[PDB]
Amino acid sequence: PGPCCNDKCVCQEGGCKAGCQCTSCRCS
Ligand SMILES: [Cd+2]
Ligand SMILES: [Cd+2]
Ligand SMILES: [Cd+2]
């Protein structure tokens, strides 16, 4: 399935999801 940052870093706000592969944020 598609996680959150597959084409969008949404950590700066709340667009991410329960599958942050993007390490550009500070999800976990
Ligand atoms: Cd991100
Ligand atoms: Cd994310
Ligand atoms: Cd995130």
Side-chain angles (χ1 to χ4, degrees):
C4 36
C5 296
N6 180 238
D7 297 278
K8 89 199 307 167
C9 191
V10 268
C11 218
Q12 256 187 138
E13 33 274 292
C16 269
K17 276 305 233 63
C20 202
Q21 148 261 33
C22 157
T23 177
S24 307
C25 35
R26 216 265 125 85
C27 228
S28 7

